[PDB]
From a paper:
The flagellar filament, a tubular structure composed of thousands of copies of the protein flagellin (FliC in many bacteria), exhibits helical symmetry in its straight non-motile forms and is supercoiled with a three-dimensional waveform in motile bacteria. Flagellar filaments can be neatly divided structurally into the two highly conserved inner domains, D0 and D1, which form the inner core of the filament, and a diverse number of outer domains, which decorate the inner core. Moreover, a comprehensive network of intermolecular interactions connecting the inner domains to the outer domains, the outer domains to one another, and the outer domains back to the inner domain filament core, is required for motility.
Although the cryo-EM structure of the PAO1 filament achieved near-atomic resolution for the inner core of the filament, the resolution of the outer domains was substantially lower, prohibiting even the tracing of the main chain of the D2 and D3 domains. Thus, we expressed and purified the fragment of FliC between residues 178–395 that forms the D2 and D3 domains and crystallized both the native protein and its selenomethionine derivative in the P2 space group with 2 molecules in the asymmetric unit. While D3 in S. Typhimurium is inserted into D2 and they form two separated domains, a different topology of the secondary structural elements in PAO1 FliC results in the D2 and D3 domains folding into a single bilobal structure with two distinct surfaces, the concave surface facing the filament core, and the convex surface exposed to the outside. On the concave side of the D2/D3 domain, residues between 233 and 242 belong to the β4-strand that occupies central position spanning both D2 and D3 and together with strands 7, 8, 10 and 11 of D3 and strand 13 of D2 they form an antiparallel β-sheet.
Author numbering: 180 to 378
């Protein structure tokens, strides 16, 4: 078991260019992965690429705001091609509320429960990118745990926004979930495929 290093987590640069080699049902197919591709785009390319292969994409993560002091957090959020500016965020509830106010523009669901767990979904698998911290806070972070194709959330969080020293892993790429009644393999040179699928 190795998990993907880009899909299903937050990274600095998102998906790297590469080629995915698919073999199954006696067919061989090569799929171009473009730099910055979303799970949505990758799934669109892979779905039905060989017979019976299903590919679905979703970007789902929990987000927690912690340690905000000296002011409040301001930062942009981009989902796919749509961007909004959040400001005055000091708690997870604040984040939830502002994501919800912007939910139509962003094409997301942002659901926070009474235990403070905020789950954010791009149902089709668009990338979610966090902008630089431009608010007054002198400390504080937004940290995320992303869901994988196995339905499990990361147990360890990564900062996507931080006051003071900037977060580095700001791009959440969703998962690509493959299913098939028949055997198939996915591979690539180096990490070109495993950045999406693990090994």
């Amino acid at each position: 078991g190795t998990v993907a290093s880009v899909a299903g987590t937050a990274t600095a640069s998102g998906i790297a260019s590469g080629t995915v080699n698919l073999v199954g049902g006696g067919q061989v197919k090569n799929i171009a992965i473009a730099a910055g591709d979303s799970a949505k785009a990758i799934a669109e390319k892979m779905d039905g690429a060989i017979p019976n292969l299903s590919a679905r994409a979703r970007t789902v993560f929990t987000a927690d705001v912690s340690g905000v002091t000296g002011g409040s957090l301001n930062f942009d959020v981009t989902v796919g091609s749509n961007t909004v500016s959040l400001a005055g965020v000091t708690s997870t509830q604040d984040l939830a509320d502002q994501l919800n106010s912007n939910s139509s523009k962003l094409g997301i669901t942002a659901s926070i429960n009474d235990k403070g767990v905020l789950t954010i979904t791009s149902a089709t698998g668009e990338n979610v990118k966090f902008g630089a911290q431009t608010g007054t806070a002198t400390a504080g972070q937004v940290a995320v745990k992303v869901q994988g194709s196995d339905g499990k959330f990361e147990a360890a969080a990564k900062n996507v926004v931080a006051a003071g020293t900037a977060a580095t892993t700001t791009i959440v790429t969703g998962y690509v979930q493959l299913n098939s009644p028949t055997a198939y393999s996915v591979s690539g040179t180096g990490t070109q495929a495993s950045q999406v699928f693990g090994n």
